[PDB]
Protein backbone atom coordinates (compact mmCIF):
# COMPACT_ATOMS: atom_id res chain seq x y z
CA UNK A 1 0.00 0.00 0.00
CA UNK A 2 2.87 2.40 0.71
CA UNK A 3 4.39 1.82 -2.73
CA UNK A 4 1.00 2.44 -4.31
CA UNK A 5 0.69 5.70 -2.37
CA UNK A 6 4.17 6.84 -3.44
CA UNK A 7 3.37 6.13 -7.09
CA UNK A 8 0.11 8.06 -6.76
CA UNK A 9 2.07 10.96 -5.29
CA UNK A 10 4.54 10.97 -8.18
CA UNK A 11 1.59 11.01 -10.57
CA UNK A 12 -0.02 13.89 -8.72
CA UNK A 13 3.32 15.67 -8.91
CA UNK A 14 4.13 15.40 -12.63
CA UNK A 15 1.10 14.23 -14.65
CA UNK A 16 -0.61 16.63 -17.06
CA UNK A 17 -4.34 17.20 -17.56
CA UNK A 18 -4.85 16.13 -21.18
CA UNK A 19 -8.43 17.42 -21.49
CA UNK A 20 -7.23 20.99 -20.99
CA UNK A 21 -4.45 20.30 -23.49
CA UNK A 22 -7.00 19.42 -26.17
CA UNK A 23 -8.67 22.84 -26.00
CA UNK A 24 -5.25 24.48 -25.75
CA UNK A 25 -4.15 22.63 -28.89
CA UNK A 26 -7.21 23.70 -30.87
CA UNK A 27 -6.97 27.33 -29.79
CA UNK A 28 -3.22 27.51 -30.43
CA UNK A 29 -3.56 25.98 -33.90
CA UNK A 30 -6.15 28.62 -34.78
CA UNK A 31 -3.93 31.30 -33.22
CA UNK A 32 -0.93 30.12 -35.26
CA UNK A 33 -2.84 30.24 -38.54
CA UNK A 34 -4.10 33.72 -37.61
CA UNK A 35 -0.56 34.84 -36.81
CA UNK A 36 0.76 33.54 -40.12
CA UNK A 37 -1.96 35.41 -42.00
CA UNK A 38 -1.23 38.56 -39.99
CA UNK A 39 2.48 38.26 -40.78
CA UNK A 40 1.69 37.95 -44.49
CA UNK A 41 -0.48 41.07 -44.35
CA UNK A 42 2.40 42.83 -42.59
CA UNK A 43 4.80 41.64 -45.31
CA UNK A 44 2.58 43.12 -48.04
CA UNK A 45 3.05 46.68 -46.72
CA UNK A 46 5.78 47.77 -49.15
CA UNK A 47 3.77 47.23 -52.34
CA UNK A 48 1.63 50.39 -52.17
CA UNK A 49 4.32 53.01 -52.87
CA UNK A 50 5.46 51.47 -56.16
CA UNK A 51 2.06 52.47 -57.59
CA UNK A 52 2.55 56.16 -56.75
CA UNK A 53 5.65 56.44 -58.94
CA UNK B 1 -16.25 36.56 -25.47
CA UNK B 2 -15.50 35.26 -28.98
CA UNK B 3 -11.72 35.10 -28.59
CA UNK B 4 -8.75 32.90 -29.49
CA UNK B 5 -7.21 33.12 -26.00
CA UNK B 6 -9.77 31.72 -23.52
CA UNK B 7 -12.70 29.28 -23.59
CA UNK B 8 -14.84 29.27 -20.44
CA UNK B 9 -17.26 26.68 -21.81
CA UNK B 10 -14.61 23.97 -22.02
CA UNK B 11 -13.66 24.84 -18.44
CA UNK B 12 -17.23 24.36 -17.21
CA UNK B 13 -17.61 21.14 -19.21
CA UNK B 14 -14.37 19.84 -17.69
CA UNK B 15 -15.67 20.62 -14.20
CA UNK B 16 -18.90 18.71 -14.80
CA UNK B 17 -16.93 15.83 -16.31
CA UNK B 18 -14.60 15.62 -13.30
CA UNK B 19 -17.67 15.54 -11.07
CA UNK B 20 -19.07 12.63 -13.08
CA UNK B 21 -15.74 10.79 -12.88
CA UNK B 22 -15.63 11.29 -9.11
CA UNK B 23 -19.12 9.80 -8.85
CA UNK B 24 -17.99 6.84 -10.96
CA UNK B 25 -14.99 6.37 -8.67
CA UNK B 26 -17.18 6.31 -5.56
CA UNK B 27 -19.55 3.83 -7.22
CA UNK B 28 -16.66 1.52 -8.14
CA UNK B 29 -15.51 1.79 -4.53
CA UNK B 30 -18.88 0.71 -3.14
CA UNK B 31 -19.05 -2.06 -5.74
CA UNK B 32 -15.64 -3.64 -5.16
CA UNK B 33 -15.81 -3.06 -1.40
CA UNK B 34 -19.39 -4.13 -0.66
CA UNK B 35 -19.78 -1.31 1.89
CA UNK B 36 -21.17 2.20 1.58
CA UNK B 37 -18.96 3.27 4.53
CA UNK B 38 -15.67 1.54 3.75
CA UNK B 39 -13.32 3.96 5.51
CA UNK B 40 -13.13 6.93 7.86
CA UNK B 41 -13.06 9.32 4.90
CA UNK B 42 -16.62 8.33 3.93
CA UNK B 43 -17.96 9.08 7.44
CA UNK B 44 -16.07 8.97 10.73
CA UNK B 45 -18.95 8.47 13.15
CA UNK B 46 -20.79 5.36 11.95
CA UNK B 47 -17.46 3.90 10.80
CA UNK B 48 -16.01 4.29 14.29
CA UNK B 49 -19.16 2.75 15.73
CA UNK B 50 -18.86 -0.18 13.32
CA UNK B 51 -15.20 -0.74 14.20
CA UNK B 52 -15.84 -0.79 17.95
CA UNK B 53 -18.95 -2.95 17.56
CA UNK C 1 -6.30 12.85 -12.15
CA UNK C 2 -7.35 12.58 -15.81
CA UNK C 3 -3.90 11.40 -16.91
CA UNK C 4 -2.44 8.77 -19.24
CA UNK C 5 0.23 7.67 -16.73
CA UNK C 6 -0.90 6.95 -13.14
CA UNK C 7 -4.19 5.11 -12.51
CA UNK C 8 -4.74 5.14 -8.74
CA UNK C 9 -8.30 3.84 -8.99
CA UNK C 10 -7.07 0.58 -10.50
CA UNK C 11 -4.61 0.34 -7.60
CA UNK C 12 -7.38 0.69 -5.02
CA UNK C 13 -9.52 -1.82 -6.91
CA UNK C 14 -6.57 -4.22 -6.94
CA UNK C 15 -6.09 -3.83 -3.19
CA UNK C 16 -9.77 -4.64 -2.67
CA UNK C 17 -9.61 -7.66 -4.99
CA UNK C 18 -6.49 -8.91 -3.19
CA UNK C 19 -8.29 -8.63 0.15
CA UNK C 20 -11.20 -10.65 -1.25
CA UNK C 21 -8.74 -13.23 -2.59
CA UNK C 22 -7.07 -13.57 0.80
CA UNK C 23 -10.47 -14.08 2.41
CA UNK C 24 -11.41 -16.77 -0.11
CA UNK C 25 -8.04 -18.45 0.42
CA UNK C 26 -8.49 -18.58 4.19
CA UNK C 27 -12.01 -19.94 3.80
CA UNK C 28 -11.03 -22.66 1.34
CA UNK C 29 -8.23 -23.59 3.74
CA UNK C 30 -10.81 -24.03 6.51
CA UNK C 31 -12.99 -26.06 4.14
CA UNK C 32 -10.07 -28.28 3.15
CA UNK C 33 -8.24 -29.01 6.41
CA UNK C 34 -11.41 -28.99 8.52
CA UNK C 35 -9.95 -26.69 11.18
CA UNK C 36 -10.28 -22.99 11.95
CA UNK C 37 -6.73 -23.18 13.37
CA UNK C 38 -4.60 -25.58 11.34
CA UNK C 39 -1.13 -24.25 12.08
CA UNK C 40 0.86 -21.91 14.29
CA UNK C 41 0.39 -19.20 11.66
CA UNK C 42 -3.35 -19.25 12.38
CA UNK C 43 -2.95 -18.64 16.14
CA UNK C 44 0.08 -19.82 18.08
CA UNK C 45 -1.22 -20.09 21.63
CA UNK C 46 -4.35 -22.21 21.15
CA UNK C 47 -2.44 -24.22 18.53
CA UNK C 48 0.33 -25.13 20.97
CA UNK C 49 -2.28 -25.90 23.63
CA UNK C 50 -4.05 -28.25 21.22
CA UNK C 51 -0.74 -29.92 20.34
CA UNK C 52 0.10 -30.59 23.98
CA UNK C 53 -3.45 -31.81 24.59
CA–CA min distance C4, chain A (Å): 8
Residues in B closer than 8 angstroms to A20, CB to CB, are 10, 14
Number of helices (H), then strands (E), in chain C: 2, 0
Cα dihedral value A18, A22, A28, A30, nearest 10: 180
Helices C8-33 and B8-33: angle between axes, nearest 10 degrees:
10
Q: Is B35 exposed, middle or buried (0-12, 13-18, 19+ CB in 10 A)?
A: exposed
Chain breaks in chain C (C to N over 2.5 A) after: none
The experimental technique used to determine this model is cryo-EM
CA–CA min distance C51, chain B (Å): 33
Residues in A closer than 8 angstroms to B5, CB to CB, are 27, 31
CA–CA min distance B52, chain A (Å): 24
Q: Alpha carbon of C5 to those of A20, B35, B38, C30: distances in Å?
A: 16, 29, 27, 41
HEC assignment per residue over A1-53: CHHHHHHHHHHHHHCCCHHHHHHHHHHHHHHHHHHHHHHHHHHHHHHHHHHCC
Backbone angles phi, psi at C8, to 5 degrees: -65, -30
Q: Rounded to whole angstroms, how far apart are CA atoms C3 and A48?
A: 53
Q: Rounded to whole angstroms, how far apart are CA atoms A51 and B38?
A: 82
Backbone angles phi, psi at C39, to 5 degrees: -160, 170
Note whether C2 and A20 are within 8 A (CB).
Answer: no
Note whether A17 and C4 are within 8 A (CB).
Answer: no
Q: Rounded to whole angstroms, how far apart are CA atoms C1 and A18?
A: 10
CB atoms within 10 A of CB C47: 16
Note whether B5 and A24 are within 8 A (CB).
Answer: no
Residues in A closer than 8 angstroms to B16, CB to CB, are none
CB atoms within 10 A of CB C34: 8
Instruction: Check CB contact of A4 with chain C, cutoff 8 Å.
Output: yes
Resolution of the solved structure (Å): 2.8
Backbone angles phi, psi at B36, to 5 degrees: -85, -10
Length of chain A: 53
Give the distance from CA B43 to its chain's centroid.
Answer: 14
Amino acid sequence: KLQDSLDAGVGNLVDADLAKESAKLQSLQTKQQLGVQALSIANQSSSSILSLF
Amino acid sequence: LNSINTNSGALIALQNLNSTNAELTQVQQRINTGKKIGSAKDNGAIWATAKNQ
